[PDB]
Amino acid sequence: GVGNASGDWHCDSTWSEGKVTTTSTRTWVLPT
Amino acid sequence: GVGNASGDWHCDSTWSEGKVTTTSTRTWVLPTYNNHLYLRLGTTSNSNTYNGFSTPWGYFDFNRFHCHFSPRDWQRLINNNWGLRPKAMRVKIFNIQVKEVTTSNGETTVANNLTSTVQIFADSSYELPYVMDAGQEGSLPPFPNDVFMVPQYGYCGIVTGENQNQTDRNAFYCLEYFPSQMLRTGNNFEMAYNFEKVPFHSMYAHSQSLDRLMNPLLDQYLWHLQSTTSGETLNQGNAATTFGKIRSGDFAFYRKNWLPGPCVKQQRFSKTASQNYKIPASGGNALLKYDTHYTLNNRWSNIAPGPPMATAGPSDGDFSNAQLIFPGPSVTGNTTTSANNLLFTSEEEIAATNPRDTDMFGQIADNNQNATTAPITGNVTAMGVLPGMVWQNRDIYYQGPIWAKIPHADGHFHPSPLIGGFGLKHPPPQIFIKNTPVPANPATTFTAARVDSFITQYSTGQVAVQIEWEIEKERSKRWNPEVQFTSNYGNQSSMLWAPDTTGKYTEPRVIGSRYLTNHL
Amino acid sequence: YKIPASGGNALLKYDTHYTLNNRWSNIAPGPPMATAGPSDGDFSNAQLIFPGPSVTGNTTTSANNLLFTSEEEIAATNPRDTDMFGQIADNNQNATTAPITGNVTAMGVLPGMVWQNRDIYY
Amino acid sequence: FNIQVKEVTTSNGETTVANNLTSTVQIFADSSYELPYVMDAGQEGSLPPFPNDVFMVPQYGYCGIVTGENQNQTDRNAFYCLEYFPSQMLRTGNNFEMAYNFEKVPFHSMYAHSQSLDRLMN
Amino acid sequence: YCGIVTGENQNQTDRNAFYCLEYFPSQMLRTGNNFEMAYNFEKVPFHSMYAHSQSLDRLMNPLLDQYLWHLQSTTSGETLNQGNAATTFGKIRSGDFAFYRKNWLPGPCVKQQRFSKTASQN
Amino acid sequence: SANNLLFTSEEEIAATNPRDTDMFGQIADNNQNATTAPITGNVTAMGVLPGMVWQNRDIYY
Amino acid sequence: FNIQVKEVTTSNGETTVANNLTSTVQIFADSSYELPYVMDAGQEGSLPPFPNDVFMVPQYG
Ligand SMILES: Nc1ncnc2c1ncn2[C@H]1C[C@H](O)[C@@H](COP(=O)(O)O)O1
Structure with missing residues (x-):
């Protein structure tokens, strides 16, 4: 719907003994 | 949906034999701070120098007592119970309305932008520096029908020396680095929290003076030396020392x-x-x-x-x-x-x-x-x-803070904020909020430079905070009537503790919590 | 004295x-x-x-x-x-x-x- | 136990004493610690050390908070009236009993240190 | 091992004690013999291996100002013993951090x- | 020195x-x-x- | 029902009115009779008799 957001802004890094997982979000502009 | 409200405005107090539950709602406005950018901060003034950063984010603060208690309620509370301590809390933000401003010449126009997002996250992890705690404006206003402006979030950095400047130790915390919820109208946010067991705050005045708790009638069985010499003159008299069994009356001398x-x-x-x-x-x-x-x-x-x-x-x-x-x-x-x-x-x-x-x-x-x-x-x-x-400990005050976070340090002694309140190792989390940026029309040919032209926006909605307080009735055996706090105001042209003809609302007196009595 | x-x-x-x-x-x-x-x-x-x-x-x-x-x-x-x-x-x-x-x-x-601490006495 | 209530005739010159069997002495102990505690400091009245010594029960009096160097009372000062508490009534042949459990408390140290703090090193 | 010293002069009191290691049971080894033992530390506060990135005195939000007021000056001017008598109070504002009630x-x-x-x- | x-x-x-x-x-x-x-x-x-x-005072290697 | 919240632009000389869809009007009725009752005596504000007459909600004092 128009009124509902379609995703949450999460940027994160989670570290493991063997693997690290990176996550980042950004806002963008698109011209014509 | 756009058409449906996402929460109802309820402000209430429900009282129990053992626990009272407060609930209040307010409407808020959120500007766009620092035109969307984090700014370094520092001044070096000699007994004041400080360093830090100012953030594009804003936060909700319900740290003042009066935020959850109507005067009468505060009264009810203090004239009847010996102690009180907070048990649990829950907050919710709703009816987000994002506005966009046209700002024509001479006249500024404002219209809703339905598809716009404001982002909220609260951090449990206490990874961000806590500031909600001390001495500061921004708490919800006491009077319900008062709209308030969400405070801007800025934090301090460790300053070495009398001169402000930064060391490698100084750190930068960027709010965008945390995952946060994104809302649009019709979206809402909610969270809950449980206070940790904490000493009931004492809401009584001692009816006994520490120095004398003994039975007036009897006398100790210990003896003290009363005088090295005779007379009442300081440097003259007969040499002999005299000892005497501490008797009723020479209380200042009683060994305690x-x-x-x-x-x-x-x-x-x-x-x-x-x-x-x-x-x-x-x-x-x-x-x-x-x-x-x-x-x-x-x-x-x-x-x-x-x-x-x-x-x-x-x-x-x-x-x-x-x-x-x-x-x-x-x-x-x-x-x-x-x-x-x-x-x-x-x-x-x-x-x-x-x-x-x-x-x-x-x-x-x-x-x-x-x-x-x-x-x-x-x-x-x-x-x-x-x-x-x-x-x-120092008493709490109707308009005084409620809690404060205990510094993360190796050693702390008898944590009790000195400004008054309950000391928590993990205090109600700061809830952050910010209006997502939006972009003005942008150039047709690509340019790497970060975009700097943004549409002007601000948002508003209501937040509701509910706290569950655990209290303990008095149960005293004192016979004579206690002192209690009652207004006692003289005839007033415009009654106290109420809005006035101008329509202004202001608190008349500062009020503590110690009216009831109890012995040591 | x-x-x-x-x-x-x-x-x-x-x-x-x-x-x-x-x-x-x-x-x-x-x-x-x-x-x-x-x-x-x-x-x-x-x-x-x-x-x-x-x-x-x-x-x-x-x-x-x-x-x-x-x-x-x-x-x-x-x-x-x-x-x-x-x-x-x-x-x-x-x-x-x-x-x-x-x-x-x-x-x-x-x-x-x-x-x-101070001792106790009979 | 063995409560014995005596009544005194107090004739002229001579005072006579005789038992009044139907008379009541009242005892209560308060757990609730609602009455100001005084038993605790520096005072006579404890049972005598030697067993075969009769003793006089101490009179109960309590102190009130004094504000200033001058004695006088404020609203804060309070009055506690013992009759306001429920208490047991005895007559000869009646007895009273009660029990209590201390709370865990650090063992008092009944030793002297054989080392001086400042030097514990080898 | 050290023994408790009384006074500025070294000498021993009855309190001083002697501990003789042979009075304890101990294991006897020869080549081919070995000794082993285990132990468990008691829960203890993690030692802090970090440096504070904030200075205690200022934890407040630089941007806002307390809602408390303090008396700033008994008189006017910047000279210690001269000035107009009046006392002045002022709401603690952003910047006068040294004054913030903490x-x-x-x-x-x-x-x-x-x-x-x-x-x-x- | x-x-x-x-x-x-x-x-x-x-x-x-x-x-x-x-x-x-x-x-x-x-x-x-x-x-x-x-x-x-x-x-x-x-x-x-x-x-x-x-x-508290720091520990040292 | 059919709540319609209007917002007024109020330009110079001319005042413009347009719907603000996301706006909230709050209603509660109290059973508990905790608020002073006033509906009862001698006063204007009741719905108009004739059906096709729009009316202005009375202010509470
Ligand atoms: N407000 C507040 N928050 C947290 N900790 C507190 C507070 N007031 C006192 N204390 C602590 C101080 C000691 O650690 C402990 C003593 O318990 P006591 O039962 O007081 O003898 O209680």
């Missing part, structure tokens, strides 16, 4: 089981301008230097109301820095000449257990007396805690 | 006391501290005094008729009653200015302190 | 003499 | 507690009055007080 207080002395000033010595606010001898302060890393930090101590009553002509000062209804600006327009908190009630702010802790023999050398007593001003001491 | 029991300079004023709400309350045997042995010729207010068999009335001239409790045993862990806690540099020494030590009389508890 | 006091403390690594300065 | 020695240091602690050579702070050691000037006392020894927070 406990010592009254931890203590730091405070300078005292008189509300009557005339009485004080002349002291400037600036220069080599600005007041600051003469007011009790603690030297930290080369910087004077003036001690805030200090280790709880007794203080002159509110009406008294003399007042100390130890007491907290609140504006008072009548005062118009940031500054005022006569202190008759201010409100003073006072801890007379504490006097029964610990030392007075302006007076000393006591006096100690500072010397080994001898027939040829007279005895000298030293005046004690600062006294750290000693085995067997018992003291009372 | 000569000291009266009454008047402007009655003993009370010179014996370590704690000012509470404008009233001197003389400190009872205070925070546990070491004290002269019972036999010793000097005694402090810190020690507890008991009548003793021979004493007839409420008052007596010679303290040889009284009984004194003493905490010599405590000496191993904490400071002496009549002596001080220690002495601290009360100044920043310098080639042109000599070092000054301050005598410390009252000392609140500090991290790492260990002390013994 | 919730905590920074440290337990004992002063220490200071010396300079350059021989000349002392 | 002390240039041949190694010194441990607790600069890091400075954020929370007082400096070794400097004092704890200064207290009003007097009751000011129009005829009598205010005197501040230098505090050298300070026992623990309610609301104090400090760091």
